[PDB]
Symmetry: C2
Subunit: 315 residues, 2 copies
Amino acid sequence: PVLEPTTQKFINALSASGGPAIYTLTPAEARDVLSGAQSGEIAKPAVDITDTTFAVGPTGATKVRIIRPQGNTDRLPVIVYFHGAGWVMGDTGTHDRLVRELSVRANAALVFVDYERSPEARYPVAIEQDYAVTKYVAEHSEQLNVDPTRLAIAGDSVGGNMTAVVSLLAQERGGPDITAQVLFYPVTDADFDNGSYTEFANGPWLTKPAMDWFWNQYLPEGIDRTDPKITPIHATSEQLSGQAPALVITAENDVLRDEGEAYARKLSQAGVDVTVTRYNGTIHDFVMLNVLADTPAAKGAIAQAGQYLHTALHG
Amino acid sequence: PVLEPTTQKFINALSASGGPAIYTLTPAEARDVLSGAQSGEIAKPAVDITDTTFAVGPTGATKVRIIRPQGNTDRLPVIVYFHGAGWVMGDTGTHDRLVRELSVRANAALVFVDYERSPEARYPVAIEQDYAVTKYVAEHSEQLNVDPTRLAIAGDSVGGNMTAVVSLLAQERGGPDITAQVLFYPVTDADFDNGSYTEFANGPWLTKPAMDWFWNQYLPEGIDRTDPKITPIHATSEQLSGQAPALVITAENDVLRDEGEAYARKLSQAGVDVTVTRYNGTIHDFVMLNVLADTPAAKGAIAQAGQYLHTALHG
Ligand SMILES: [Mg+2]
Ligand SMILES: [Mg+2]
Ligand SMILES: [Mg+2]
């Protein structure tokens, strides 16, 4: 359907500039393209930043960035954050404004997992790093000065996939305890022939061929994609029941729209308390992309997620 | 699609023992059904309440209820509120919890218009009362101890129709200035054959025959229904341009969904900044009905609207 006007101007400018398709690029090139898009002078909430490594995960180490509202030294609730951008791309820079907004709005520490990206690392390295850091935070709360009984998880796009799977792993492994989960336009299935994949196959912004490529970078060739730790839409009502309350936010004009909304239904059917909202007039990645930060959908969704997290972690 | 479970329980109870269809009742009887449904003791935000009358509007007197956050005597911004329930039903009791939430969350005075109901009063009595009260508030700010430069309007269902029309009338008549407008699942058209009307014709909760009956109570026989003061979807890009930023919230499972989302697009095409959000798993009237008060969609939408108003009126 018809896009919000600032969002439309972005899409048209992108067409006019005529850049190479994402799946013709090397990982390094693809990374640099998104990094360059997100390198502008933009207003950002004030935070204190620490870059470090936790000695956990399948590789023995996971890079993290810890963010706190600037000057706040309280024992805060904590968000463990899993970023999107196709498994191949994304870093502390590309998602900086977004995760600063979440930290300050939630009034929480936020632990950004700088997981090993694809294709150099394939499934399941990142989800195991993600799970390991979440467990680490829960088990090292005095050192991080956080309250482990108020731990939320959150992520955008493939990072929403990671959020869902960490919830699933925490159920299976008996912890850690999760207070709430937030999923921005999550990847939850690999059915490239559903309604929204068919309708929006040629965009805007995200295309079916692009998703085909991202999935092929993430996964080993020939792996069974129906397994719930890959496509959590297939999780059993068992794996889902008992999970933390969820906020799921989708975009109207998005190949991934239908699977995110279907996943929200699956959670709800399993007895999970699910807040699920579709934003009209916007596109995939709309709370991360700096070019859309002043659009009404981006502002609304960030305010909604911030408030949802604040209530979950302080109410 | 499938409803949130508590919401489905409500719908199941109606199908089991809901009785005669609302539109087969007298207006008195219909009024009493909703009044009874909403008169349960339930947790509500603390406010101060004043019931009075402003000597304006087509009848010479419009009943209003003025709500403030409890004990607050500050010169506050103000919301003028137009309630829903089919033009036939609704009063200060049916919408009590909802408008208390908005007052407290926006930290604003709220002026609830107890307009004359249909069919005893037809169009255009209520919209002229509604506009008159809005003008009155702008022009008697010292009497009411409010800031007239921070005046918002808001409404639900046919009250969303009223919000749209008051915006239009204010454009046409040169004021008063409106800072923001909030429309919960508005009535904007009378095309009973569109997509969502066809899909949800027999419910849940709101039905196509009910809407046909409500419209018939509201309107004189043979009136041209395409007048934008009746169906604001027909407003020109000129009646719309210049209007205040809008929040439009729709329900997934609702005959009125498509016309609400279409109206949002019409505003956006006219250059208005429109925040438009569809809540999945819920039904029409979901922010007013007390039985749904603790459901995720109701809590979410009320928090969203409350925060949107707070930002508009205090930012
Ligand atoms: Mg989506
Ligand atoms: Mg609706
Ligand atoms: Mg818009």
